[PDB]
PDB file of C-alpha atoms in Angstrom:
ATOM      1  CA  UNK A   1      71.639 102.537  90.129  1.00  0.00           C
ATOM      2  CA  UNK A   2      71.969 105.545  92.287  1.00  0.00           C
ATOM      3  CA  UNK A   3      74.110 102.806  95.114  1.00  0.00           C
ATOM      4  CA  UNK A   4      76.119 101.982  91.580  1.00  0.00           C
ATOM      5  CA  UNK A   5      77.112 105.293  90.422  1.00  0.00           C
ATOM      6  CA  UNK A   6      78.649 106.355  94.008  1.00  0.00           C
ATOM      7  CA  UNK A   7      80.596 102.781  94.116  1.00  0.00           C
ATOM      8  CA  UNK A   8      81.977 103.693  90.730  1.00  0.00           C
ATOM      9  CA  UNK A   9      83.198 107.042  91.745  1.00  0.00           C
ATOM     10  CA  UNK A  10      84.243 106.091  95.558  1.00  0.00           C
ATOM     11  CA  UNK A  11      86.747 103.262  93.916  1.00  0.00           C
ATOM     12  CA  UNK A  12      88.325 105.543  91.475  1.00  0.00           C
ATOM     13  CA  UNK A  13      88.761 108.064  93.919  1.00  0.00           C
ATOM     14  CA  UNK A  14      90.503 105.597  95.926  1.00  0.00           C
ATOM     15  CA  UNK A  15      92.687 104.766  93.531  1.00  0.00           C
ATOM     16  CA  UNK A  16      94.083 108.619  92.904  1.00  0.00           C
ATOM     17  CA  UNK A  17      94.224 109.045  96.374  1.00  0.00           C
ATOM     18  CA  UNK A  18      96.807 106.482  97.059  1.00  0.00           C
ATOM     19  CA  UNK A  19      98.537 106.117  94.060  1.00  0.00           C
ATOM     20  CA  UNK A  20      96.871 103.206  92.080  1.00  0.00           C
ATOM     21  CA  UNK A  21      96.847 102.942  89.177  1.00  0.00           C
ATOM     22  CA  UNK A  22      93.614 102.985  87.255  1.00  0.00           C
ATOM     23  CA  UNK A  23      91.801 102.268  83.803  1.00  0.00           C
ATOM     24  CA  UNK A  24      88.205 104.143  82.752  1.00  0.00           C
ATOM     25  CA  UNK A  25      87.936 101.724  80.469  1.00  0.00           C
ATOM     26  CA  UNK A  26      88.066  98.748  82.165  1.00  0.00           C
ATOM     27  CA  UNK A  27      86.167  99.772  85.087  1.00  0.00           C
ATOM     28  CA  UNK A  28      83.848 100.857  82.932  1.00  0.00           C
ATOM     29  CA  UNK A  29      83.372  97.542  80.844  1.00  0.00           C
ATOM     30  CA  UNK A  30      83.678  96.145  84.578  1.00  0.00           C
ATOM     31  CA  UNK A  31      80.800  97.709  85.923  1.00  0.00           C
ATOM     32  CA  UNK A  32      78.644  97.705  82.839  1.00  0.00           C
ATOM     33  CA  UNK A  33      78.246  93.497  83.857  1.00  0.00           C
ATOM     34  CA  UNK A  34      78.521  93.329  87.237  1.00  0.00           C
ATOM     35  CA  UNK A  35      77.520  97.035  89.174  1.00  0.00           C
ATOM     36  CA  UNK A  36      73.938  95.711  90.363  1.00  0.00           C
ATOM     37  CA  UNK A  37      75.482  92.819  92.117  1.00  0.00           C
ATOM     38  CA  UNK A  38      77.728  94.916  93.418  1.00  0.00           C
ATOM     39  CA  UNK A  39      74.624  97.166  95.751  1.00  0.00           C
ATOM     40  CA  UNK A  40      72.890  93.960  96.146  1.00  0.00           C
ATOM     41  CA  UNK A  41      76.106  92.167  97.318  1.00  0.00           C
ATOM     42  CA  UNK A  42      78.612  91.920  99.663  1.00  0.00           C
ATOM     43  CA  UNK A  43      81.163  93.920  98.404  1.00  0.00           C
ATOM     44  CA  UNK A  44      84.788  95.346  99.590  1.00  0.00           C
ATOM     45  CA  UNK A  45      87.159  97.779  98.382  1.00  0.00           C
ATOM     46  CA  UNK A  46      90.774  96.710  99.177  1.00  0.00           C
ATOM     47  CA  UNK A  47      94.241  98.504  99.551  1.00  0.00           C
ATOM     48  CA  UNK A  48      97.159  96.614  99.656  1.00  0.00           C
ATOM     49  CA  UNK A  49     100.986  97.497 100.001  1.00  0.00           C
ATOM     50  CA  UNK A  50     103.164  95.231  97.552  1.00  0.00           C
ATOM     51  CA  UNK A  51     104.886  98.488  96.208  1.00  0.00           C
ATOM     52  CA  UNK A  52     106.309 101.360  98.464  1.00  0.00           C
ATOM     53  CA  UNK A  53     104.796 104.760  98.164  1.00  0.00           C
ATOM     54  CA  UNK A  54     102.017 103.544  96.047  1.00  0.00           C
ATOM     55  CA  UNK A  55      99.061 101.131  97.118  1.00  0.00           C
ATOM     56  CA  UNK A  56      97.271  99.010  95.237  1.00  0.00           C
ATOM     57  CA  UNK A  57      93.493  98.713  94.720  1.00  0.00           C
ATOM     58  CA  UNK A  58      91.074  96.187  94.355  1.00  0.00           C
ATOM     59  CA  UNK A  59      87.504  95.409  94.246  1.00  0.00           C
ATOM     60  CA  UNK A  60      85.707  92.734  95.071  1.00  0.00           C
ATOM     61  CA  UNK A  61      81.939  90.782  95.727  1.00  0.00           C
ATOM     62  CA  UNK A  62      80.598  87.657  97.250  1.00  0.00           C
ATOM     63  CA  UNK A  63      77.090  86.505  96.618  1.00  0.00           C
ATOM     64  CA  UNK A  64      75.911  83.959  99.407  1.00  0.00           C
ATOM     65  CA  UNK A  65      72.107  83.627  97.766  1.00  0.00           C
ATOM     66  CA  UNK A  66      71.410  80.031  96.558  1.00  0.00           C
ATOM     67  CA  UNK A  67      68.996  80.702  93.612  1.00  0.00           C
ATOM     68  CA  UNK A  68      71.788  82.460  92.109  1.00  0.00           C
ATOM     69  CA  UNK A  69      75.117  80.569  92.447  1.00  0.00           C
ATOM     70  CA  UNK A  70      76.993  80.531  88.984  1.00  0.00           C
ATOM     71  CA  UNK A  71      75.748  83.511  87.707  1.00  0.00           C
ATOM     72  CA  UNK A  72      78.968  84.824  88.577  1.00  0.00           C
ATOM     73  CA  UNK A  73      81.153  82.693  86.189  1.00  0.00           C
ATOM     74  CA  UNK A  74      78.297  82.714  83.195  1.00  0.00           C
ATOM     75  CA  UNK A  75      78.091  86.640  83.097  1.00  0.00           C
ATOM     76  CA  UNK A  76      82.201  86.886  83.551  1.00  0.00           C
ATOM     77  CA  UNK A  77      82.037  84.375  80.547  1.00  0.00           C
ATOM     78  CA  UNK A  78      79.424  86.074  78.085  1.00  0.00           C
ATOM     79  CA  UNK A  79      80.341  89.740  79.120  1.00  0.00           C
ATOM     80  CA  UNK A  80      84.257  88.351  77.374  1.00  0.00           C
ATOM     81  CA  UNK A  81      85.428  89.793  80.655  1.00  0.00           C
ATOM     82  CA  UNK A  82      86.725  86.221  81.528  1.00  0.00           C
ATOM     83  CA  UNK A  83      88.259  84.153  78.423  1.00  0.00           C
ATOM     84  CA  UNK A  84      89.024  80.872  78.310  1.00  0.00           C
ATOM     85  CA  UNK A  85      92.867  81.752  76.989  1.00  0.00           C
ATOM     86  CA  UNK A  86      93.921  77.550  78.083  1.00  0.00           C
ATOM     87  CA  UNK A  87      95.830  78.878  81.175  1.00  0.00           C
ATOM     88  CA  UNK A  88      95.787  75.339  83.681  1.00  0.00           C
ATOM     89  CA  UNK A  89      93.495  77.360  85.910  1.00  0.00           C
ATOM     90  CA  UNK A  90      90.893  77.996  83.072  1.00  0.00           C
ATOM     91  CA  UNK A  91      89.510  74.428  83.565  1.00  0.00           C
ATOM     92  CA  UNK A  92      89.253  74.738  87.805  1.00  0.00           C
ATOM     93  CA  UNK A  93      85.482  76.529  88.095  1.00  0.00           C
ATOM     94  CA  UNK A  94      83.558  73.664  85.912  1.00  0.00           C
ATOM     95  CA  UNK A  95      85.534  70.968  88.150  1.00  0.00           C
ATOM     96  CA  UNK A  96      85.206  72.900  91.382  1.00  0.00           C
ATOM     97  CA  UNK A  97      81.272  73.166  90.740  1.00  0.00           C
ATOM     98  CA  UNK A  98      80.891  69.635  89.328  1.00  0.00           C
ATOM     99  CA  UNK A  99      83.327  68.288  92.353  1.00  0.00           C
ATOM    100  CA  UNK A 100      81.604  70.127  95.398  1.00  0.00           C
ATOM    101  CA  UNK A 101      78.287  71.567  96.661  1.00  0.00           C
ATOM    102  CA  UNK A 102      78.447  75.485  96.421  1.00  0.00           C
ATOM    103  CA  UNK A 103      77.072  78.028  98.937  1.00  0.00           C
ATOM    104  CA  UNK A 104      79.244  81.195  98.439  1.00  0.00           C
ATOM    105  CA  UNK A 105      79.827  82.759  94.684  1.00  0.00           C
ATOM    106  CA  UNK A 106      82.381  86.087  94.160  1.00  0.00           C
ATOM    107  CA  UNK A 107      84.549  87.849  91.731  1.00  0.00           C
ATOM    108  CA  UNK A 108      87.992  89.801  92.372  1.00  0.00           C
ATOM    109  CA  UNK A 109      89.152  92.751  90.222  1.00  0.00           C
ATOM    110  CA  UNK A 110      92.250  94.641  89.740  1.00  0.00           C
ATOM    111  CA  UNK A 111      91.616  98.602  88.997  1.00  0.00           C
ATOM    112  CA  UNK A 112      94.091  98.551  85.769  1.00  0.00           C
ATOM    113  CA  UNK A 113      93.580  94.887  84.635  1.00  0.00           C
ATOM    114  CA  UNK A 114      89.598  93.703  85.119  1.00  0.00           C
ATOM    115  CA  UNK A 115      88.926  90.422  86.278  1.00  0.00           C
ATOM    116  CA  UNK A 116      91.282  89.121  88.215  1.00  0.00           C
ATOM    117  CA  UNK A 117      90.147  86.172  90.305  1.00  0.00           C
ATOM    118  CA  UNK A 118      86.921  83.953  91.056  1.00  0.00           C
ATOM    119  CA  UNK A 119      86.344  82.063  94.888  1.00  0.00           C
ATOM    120  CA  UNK A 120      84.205  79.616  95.530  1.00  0.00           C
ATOM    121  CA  UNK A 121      82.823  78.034  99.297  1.00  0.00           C
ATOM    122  CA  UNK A 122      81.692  74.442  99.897  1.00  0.00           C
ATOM    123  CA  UNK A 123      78.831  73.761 101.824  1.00  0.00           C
ATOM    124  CA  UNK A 124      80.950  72.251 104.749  1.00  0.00           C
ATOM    125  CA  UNK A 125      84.593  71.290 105.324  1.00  0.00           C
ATOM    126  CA  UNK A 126      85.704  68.842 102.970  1.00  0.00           C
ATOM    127  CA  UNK A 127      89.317  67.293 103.616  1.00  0.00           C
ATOM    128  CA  UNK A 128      91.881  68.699 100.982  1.00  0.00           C
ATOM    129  CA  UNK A 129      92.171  64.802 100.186  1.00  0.00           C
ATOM    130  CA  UNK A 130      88.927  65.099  98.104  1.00  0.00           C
ATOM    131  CA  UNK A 131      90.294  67.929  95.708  1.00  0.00           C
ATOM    132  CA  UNK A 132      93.448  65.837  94.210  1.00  0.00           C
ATOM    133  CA  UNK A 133      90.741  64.635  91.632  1.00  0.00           C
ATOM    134  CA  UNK A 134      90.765  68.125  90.476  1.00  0.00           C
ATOM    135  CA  UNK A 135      93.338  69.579  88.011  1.00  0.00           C
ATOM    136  CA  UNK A 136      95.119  71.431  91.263  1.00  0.00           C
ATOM    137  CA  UNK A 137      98.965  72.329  90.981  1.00  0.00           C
ATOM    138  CA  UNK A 138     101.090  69.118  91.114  1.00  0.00           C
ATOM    139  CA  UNK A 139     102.033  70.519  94.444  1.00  0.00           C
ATOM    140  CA  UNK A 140      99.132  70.740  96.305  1.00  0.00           C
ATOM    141  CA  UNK A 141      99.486  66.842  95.950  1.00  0.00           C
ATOM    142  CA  UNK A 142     102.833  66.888  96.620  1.00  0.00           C
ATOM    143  CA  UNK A 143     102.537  69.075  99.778  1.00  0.00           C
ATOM    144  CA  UNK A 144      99.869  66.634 101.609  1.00  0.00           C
ATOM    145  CA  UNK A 145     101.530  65.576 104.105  1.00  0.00           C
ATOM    146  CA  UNK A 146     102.705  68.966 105.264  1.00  0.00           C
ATOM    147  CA  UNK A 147      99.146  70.145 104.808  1.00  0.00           C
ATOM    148  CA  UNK A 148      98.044  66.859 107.314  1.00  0.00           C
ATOM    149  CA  UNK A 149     100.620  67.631 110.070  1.00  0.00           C
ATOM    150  CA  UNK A 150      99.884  71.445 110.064  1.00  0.00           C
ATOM    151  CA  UNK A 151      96.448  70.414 110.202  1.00  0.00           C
ATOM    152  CA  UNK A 152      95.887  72.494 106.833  1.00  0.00           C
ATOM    153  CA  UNK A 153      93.689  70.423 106.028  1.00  0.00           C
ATOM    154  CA  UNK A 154      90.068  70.892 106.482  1.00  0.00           C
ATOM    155  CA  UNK A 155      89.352  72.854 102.774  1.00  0.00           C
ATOM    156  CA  UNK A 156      86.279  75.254 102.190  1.00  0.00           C
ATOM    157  CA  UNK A 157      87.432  77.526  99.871  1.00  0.00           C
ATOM    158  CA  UNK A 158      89.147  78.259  96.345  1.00  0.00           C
ATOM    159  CA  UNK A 159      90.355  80.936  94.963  1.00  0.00           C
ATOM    160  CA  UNK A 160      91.347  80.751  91.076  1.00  0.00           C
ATOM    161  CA  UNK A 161      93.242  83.615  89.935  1.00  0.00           C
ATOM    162  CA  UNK A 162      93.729  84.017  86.366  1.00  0.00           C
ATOM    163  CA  UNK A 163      96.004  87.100  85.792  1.00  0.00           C
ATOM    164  CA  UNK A 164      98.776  84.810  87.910  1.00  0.00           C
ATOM    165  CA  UNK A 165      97.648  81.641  87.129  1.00  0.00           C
ATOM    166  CA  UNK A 166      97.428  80.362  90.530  1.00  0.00           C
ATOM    167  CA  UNK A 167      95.261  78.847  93.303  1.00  0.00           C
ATOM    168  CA  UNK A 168      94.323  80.001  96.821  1.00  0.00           C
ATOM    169  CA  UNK A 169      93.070  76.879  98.958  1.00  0.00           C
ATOM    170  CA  UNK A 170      91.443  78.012 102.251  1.00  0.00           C
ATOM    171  CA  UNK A 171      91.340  76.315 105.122  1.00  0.00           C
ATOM    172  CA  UNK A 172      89.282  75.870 108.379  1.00  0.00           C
ATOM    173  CA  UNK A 173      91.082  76.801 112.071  1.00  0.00           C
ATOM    174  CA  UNK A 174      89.507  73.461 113.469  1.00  0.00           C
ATOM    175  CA  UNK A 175      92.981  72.481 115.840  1.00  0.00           C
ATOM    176  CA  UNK A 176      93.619  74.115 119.521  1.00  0.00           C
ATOM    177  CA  UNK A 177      97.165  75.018 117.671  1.00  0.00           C
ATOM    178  CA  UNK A 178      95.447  77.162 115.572  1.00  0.00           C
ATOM    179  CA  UNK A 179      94.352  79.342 118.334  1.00  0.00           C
ATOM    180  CA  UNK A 180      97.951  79.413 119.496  1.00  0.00           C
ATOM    181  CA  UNK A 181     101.120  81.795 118.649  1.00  0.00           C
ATOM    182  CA  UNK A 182     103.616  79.313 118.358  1.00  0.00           C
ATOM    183  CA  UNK A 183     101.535  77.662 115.932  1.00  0.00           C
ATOM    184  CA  UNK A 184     101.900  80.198 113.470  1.00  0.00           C
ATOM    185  CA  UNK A 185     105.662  81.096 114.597  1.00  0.00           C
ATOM    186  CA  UNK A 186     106.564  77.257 113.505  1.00  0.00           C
ATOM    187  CA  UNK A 187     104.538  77.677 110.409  1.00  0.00           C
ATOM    188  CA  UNK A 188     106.514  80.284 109.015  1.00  0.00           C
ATOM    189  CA  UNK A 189     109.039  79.148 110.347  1.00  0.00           C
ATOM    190  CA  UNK A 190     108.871  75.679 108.760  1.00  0.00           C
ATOM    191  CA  UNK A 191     107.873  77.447 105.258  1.00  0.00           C
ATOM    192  CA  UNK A 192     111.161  79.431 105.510  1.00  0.00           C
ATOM    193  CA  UNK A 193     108.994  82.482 105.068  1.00  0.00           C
ATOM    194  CA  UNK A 194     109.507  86.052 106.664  1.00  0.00           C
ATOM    195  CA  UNK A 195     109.149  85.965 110.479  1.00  0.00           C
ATOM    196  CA  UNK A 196     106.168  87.920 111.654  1.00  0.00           C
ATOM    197  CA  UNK A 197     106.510  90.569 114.236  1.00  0.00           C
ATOM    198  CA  UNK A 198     105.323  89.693 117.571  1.00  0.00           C
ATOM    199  CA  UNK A 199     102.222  91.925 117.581  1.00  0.00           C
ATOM    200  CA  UNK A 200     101.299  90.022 114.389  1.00  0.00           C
ATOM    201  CA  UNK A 201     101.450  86.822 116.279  1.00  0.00           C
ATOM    202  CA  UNK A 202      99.595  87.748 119.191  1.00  0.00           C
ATOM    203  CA  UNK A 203      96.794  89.125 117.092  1.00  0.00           C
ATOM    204  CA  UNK A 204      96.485  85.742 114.985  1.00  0.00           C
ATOM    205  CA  UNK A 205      95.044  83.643 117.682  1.00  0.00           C
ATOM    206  CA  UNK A 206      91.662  85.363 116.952  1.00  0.00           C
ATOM    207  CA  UNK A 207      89.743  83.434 115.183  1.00  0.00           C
ATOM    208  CA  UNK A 208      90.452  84.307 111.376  1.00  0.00           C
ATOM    209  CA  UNK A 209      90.755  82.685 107.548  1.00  0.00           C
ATOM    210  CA  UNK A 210      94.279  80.985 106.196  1.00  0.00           C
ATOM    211  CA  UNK A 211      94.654  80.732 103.006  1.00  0.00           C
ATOM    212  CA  UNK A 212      97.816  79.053 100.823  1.00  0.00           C
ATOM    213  CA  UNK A 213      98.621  79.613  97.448  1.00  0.00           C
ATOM    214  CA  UNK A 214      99.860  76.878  95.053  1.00  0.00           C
ATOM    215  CA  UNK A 215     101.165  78.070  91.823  1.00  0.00           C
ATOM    216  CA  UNK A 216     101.073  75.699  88.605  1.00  0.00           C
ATOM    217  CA  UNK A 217     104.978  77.022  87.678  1.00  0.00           C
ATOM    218  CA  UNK A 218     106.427  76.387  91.362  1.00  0.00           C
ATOM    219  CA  UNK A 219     107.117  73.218  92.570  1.00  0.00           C
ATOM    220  CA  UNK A 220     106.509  75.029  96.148  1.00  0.00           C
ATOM    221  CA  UNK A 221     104.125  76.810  98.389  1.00  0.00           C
ATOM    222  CA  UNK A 222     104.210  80.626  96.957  1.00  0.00           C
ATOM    223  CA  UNK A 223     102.048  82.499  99.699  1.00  0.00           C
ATOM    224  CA  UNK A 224     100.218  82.183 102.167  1.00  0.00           C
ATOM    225  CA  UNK A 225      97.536  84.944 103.581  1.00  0.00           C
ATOM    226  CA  UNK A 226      96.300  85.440 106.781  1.00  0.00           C
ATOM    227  CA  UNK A 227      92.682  86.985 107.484  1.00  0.00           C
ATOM    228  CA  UNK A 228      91.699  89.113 110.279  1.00  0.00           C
ATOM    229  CA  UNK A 229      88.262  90.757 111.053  1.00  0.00           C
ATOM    230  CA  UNK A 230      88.172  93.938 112.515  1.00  0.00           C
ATOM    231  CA  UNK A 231      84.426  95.948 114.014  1.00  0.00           C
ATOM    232  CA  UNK A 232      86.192  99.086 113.045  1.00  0.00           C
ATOM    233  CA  UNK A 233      88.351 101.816 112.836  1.00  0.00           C
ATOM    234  CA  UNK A 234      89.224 101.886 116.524  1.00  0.00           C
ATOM    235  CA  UNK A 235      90.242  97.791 116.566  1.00  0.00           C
ATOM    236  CA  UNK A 236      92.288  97.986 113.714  1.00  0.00           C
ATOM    237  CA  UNK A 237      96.136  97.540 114.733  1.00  0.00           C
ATOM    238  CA  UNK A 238      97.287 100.276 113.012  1.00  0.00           C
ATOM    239  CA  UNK A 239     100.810 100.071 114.281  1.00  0.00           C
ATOM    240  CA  UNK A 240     101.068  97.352 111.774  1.00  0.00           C
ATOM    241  CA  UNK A 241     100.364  99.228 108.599  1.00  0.00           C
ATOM    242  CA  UNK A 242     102.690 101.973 107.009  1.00  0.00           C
ATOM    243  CA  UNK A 243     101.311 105.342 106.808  1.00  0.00           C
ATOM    244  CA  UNK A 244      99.477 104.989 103.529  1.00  0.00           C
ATOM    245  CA  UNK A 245      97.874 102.313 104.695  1.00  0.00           C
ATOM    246  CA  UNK A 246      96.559 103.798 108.087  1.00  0.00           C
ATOM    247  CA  UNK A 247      95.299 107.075 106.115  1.00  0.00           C
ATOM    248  CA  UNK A 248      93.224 104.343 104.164  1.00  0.00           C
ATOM    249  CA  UNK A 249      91.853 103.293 107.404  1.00  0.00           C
ATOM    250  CA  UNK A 250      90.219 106.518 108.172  1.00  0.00           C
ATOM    251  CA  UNK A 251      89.528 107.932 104.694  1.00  0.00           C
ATOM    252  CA  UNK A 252      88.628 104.346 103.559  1.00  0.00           C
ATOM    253  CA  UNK A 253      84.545 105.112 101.351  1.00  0.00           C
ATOM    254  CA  UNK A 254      81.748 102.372 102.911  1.00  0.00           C
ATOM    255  CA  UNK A 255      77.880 103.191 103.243  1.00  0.00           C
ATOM    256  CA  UNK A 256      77.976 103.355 107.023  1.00  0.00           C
ATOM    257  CA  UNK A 257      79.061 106.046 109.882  1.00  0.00           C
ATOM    258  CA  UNK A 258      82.193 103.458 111.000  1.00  0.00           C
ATOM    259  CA  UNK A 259      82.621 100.336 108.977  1.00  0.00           C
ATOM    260  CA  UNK A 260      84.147  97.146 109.452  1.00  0.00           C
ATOM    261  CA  UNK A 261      87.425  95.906 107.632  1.00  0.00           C
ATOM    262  CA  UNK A 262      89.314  92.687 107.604  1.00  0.00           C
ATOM    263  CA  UNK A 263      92.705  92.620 107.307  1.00  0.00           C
ATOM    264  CA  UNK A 264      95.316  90.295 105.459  1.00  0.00           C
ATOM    265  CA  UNK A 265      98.955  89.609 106.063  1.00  0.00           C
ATOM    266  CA  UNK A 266     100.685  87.673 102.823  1.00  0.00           C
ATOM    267  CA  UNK A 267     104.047  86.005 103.575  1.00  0.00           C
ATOM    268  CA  UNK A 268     106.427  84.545 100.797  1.00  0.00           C
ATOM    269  CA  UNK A 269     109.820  83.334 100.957  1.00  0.00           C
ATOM    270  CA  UNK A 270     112.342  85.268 103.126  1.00  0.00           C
ATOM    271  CA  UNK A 271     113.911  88.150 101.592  1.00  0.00           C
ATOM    272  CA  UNK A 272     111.698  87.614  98.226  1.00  0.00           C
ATOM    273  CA  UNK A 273     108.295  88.355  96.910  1.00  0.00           C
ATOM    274  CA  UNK A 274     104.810  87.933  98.853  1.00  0.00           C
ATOM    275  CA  UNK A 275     105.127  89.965 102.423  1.00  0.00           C
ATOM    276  CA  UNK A 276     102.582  92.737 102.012  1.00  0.00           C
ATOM    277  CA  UNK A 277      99.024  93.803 103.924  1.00  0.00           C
ATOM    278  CA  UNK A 278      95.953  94.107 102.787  1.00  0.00           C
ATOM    279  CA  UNK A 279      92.998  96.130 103.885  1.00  0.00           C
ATOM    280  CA  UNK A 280      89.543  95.490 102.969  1.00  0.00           C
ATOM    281  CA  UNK A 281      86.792  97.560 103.803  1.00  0.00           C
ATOM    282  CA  UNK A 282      83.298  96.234 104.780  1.00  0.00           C
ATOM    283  CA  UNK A 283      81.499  98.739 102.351  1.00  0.00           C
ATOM    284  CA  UNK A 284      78.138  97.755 103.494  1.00  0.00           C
ATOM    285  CA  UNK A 285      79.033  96.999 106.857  1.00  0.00           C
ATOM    286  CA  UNK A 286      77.567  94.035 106.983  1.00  0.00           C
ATOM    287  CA  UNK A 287      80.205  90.985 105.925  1.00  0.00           C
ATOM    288  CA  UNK A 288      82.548  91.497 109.285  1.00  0.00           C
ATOM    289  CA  UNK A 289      80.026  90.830 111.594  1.00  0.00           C
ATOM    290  CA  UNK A 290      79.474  87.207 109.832  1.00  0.00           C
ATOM    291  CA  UNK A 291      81.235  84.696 112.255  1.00  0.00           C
TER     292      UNK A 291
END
């Protein structure tokens, strides 16, 4: 309870630092349910540049132990945190956990808003084939075949996020393409999203997550997130972040001398919505060194 205090206070400091906009309240009723998983968790704090001269700030935990998968979803339910309000995504978690074998549990929340998203990891891969059953977006159905021939296809991951109403599918980096520039240069390409700079593309080879997001209002692919580990401060491309977001590199509050962060580049239709950068730090340190 001393660990949960000094989480409290580091992410509302980070939030007036850079400009996000908080809520007492809602942190408060946030950590009142969920603070001890927080210490005994995986956990990152997250800065992310949708808006210009403020960033954005986010929390969020992952709990990998077996003998207490679910417990995520029942507290977020009895707490009233999470309410079944009859959005399409409000249905997803039961299915999910009914459909697939879990091994990974975890929670996302926005600083002024609460609760804003749950994830959930199967066991193995699964092909994406196996999740139609569920009651996905029409066009994660409908996008298939794109999904097959840019070998998006090898699921492990959802991520159901409530305050948009939307889905983030996750998939493994199983092809030799995917360890390639030009794969991700014709990806972009073919999803008419904003180019990514050449640095971006040479760093992407690394072995990282990709995650797409399928909205239930869009006939289309909305997003679509890459995820990059970084040991620390010193291999973090900071040419690639705006100056808010490099000062949360080096100011960014973890439990260790030099922690860990991974990284995430969001790309959306050119000239629109969804190009923005995420940072996440490894407040433990002790999720980026997992493989």
């Amino acid at each position: 309870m001393n660990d949960v205090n000094r989480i409290r206070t580091d992410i509302i400091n980070v939030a007036k630092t850079f400009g996000a906009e908080y809520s007492e309240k809602v942190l408060d009723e946030v950590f009142q349910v969920f603070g001890e998983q927080f210490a005994d968790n995986s956990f990152m704090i997250r800065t992310s540049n949708k808006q210009p001269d403020k960033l954005g700030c986010y929390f969020r935990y992952h709990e990998e132990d077996e003998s207490q998968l679910g417990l995520a979803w029942d507290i977020a339910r009895k707490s009233g945190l999470l309410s079944d309000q009859g959005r399409p995504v409000d249905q997803l978690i039961p299915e999910i956990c009914e459909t697939f074998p879990i091994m990974a549990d975890g929670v996302d929340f926005d600083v002024k808003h609460g609760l804003a998203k749950i994830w959930q990891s199967i066991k193995g891969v699964v092909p994406v084939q196996d999740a139609f059953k569920l009651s996905l977006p029409a066009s994660v159905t409908t996008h298939s075949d794109f999904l097959k021939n840019h070998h998006l296809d090898a699921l492990y991951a959802f991520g159901i996020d409530y305050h948009h109403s939307s889905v983030n599918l996750y998939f493994d980096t199983y092809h030799p393409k995917h360890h390639t520039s030009e794969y991700y240069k014709n990806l972009l390409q073919d999803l008419q999203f904003q180019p990514p700079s050449d640095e971006l593309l040479e760093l992407l080879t690394n072995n990282g997550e990709i995650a797409l997001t399928f909205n239930f209002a869009s006939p289309r692919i909305e997003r679509l997130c890459f995820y990059l580990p970084f040991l620390n401060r010193e291999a973090v491309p900071q040419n690639l972040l705006n100056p808010l977001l490099k000062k949360y590199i080096n100011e960014a509050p973890a439990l260790v001398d030099n922690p860990g962060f991974i990284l995430g580049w969001s790309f959306g239709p050119q000239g629109g919505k969804g190009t923005y950068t995420k940072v996440d730090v490894d407040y433990h340190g002790r999720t980026v060194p997992l493989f």
